Amino acid sequence: MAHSPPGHHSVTGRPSVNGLALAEYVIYRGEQAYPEYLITYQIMRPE
């Protein structure tokens, strides 16, 4: 795993082209996330 940029705990990827996209985020230590819900699903064929 890489290191966080110095003085930061994560990176935020702010989309600057696709106006409909929300943010993506990167952490560099496993201890900074807890997997709280497991969701089981299918994608649905559009009609």
Partner: protein
Amino acid sequence: GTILIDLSPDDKEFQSVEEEMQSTVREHRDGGHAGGIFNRYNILKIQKVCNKKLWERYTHRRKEVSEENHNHANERMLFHGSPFVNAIIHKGFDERHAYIGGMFGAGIYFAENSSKSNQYVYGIGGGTGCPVHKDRSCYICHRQLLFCRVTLGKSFLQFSA
């Protein structure tokens, strides 16, 4: 150490998680290549993930981050899609779950858009799709995502395409 507790569809907690999942679907620039073609999901099950050791590890680190950032953990709830979802719920996130080739470096990646994480359930780029039909847009096979509590602390803002 991990136990999984099923939520009832009647429970407000099931409903709030479902709503976050459905309401954050978007269209993707690959036309559905990685994650398939869809506007919404059929949610089959939502389970709460309970592991005391992994929780205490998370809250320990959260307090350290908070103390380094004016008592602000900057905690978010975000999606993670991965072929390693079973390992993650039993042993926690670590370096094995990093996206070595990700655009912001080798770290663990999370999305606000559920449909973004959906693109990684069968691997990077959607891999070869579902194990049974080798279809990235399979409408039959059961998929799994995680909805995770993530401490961001002071986050480096990267503007990007």
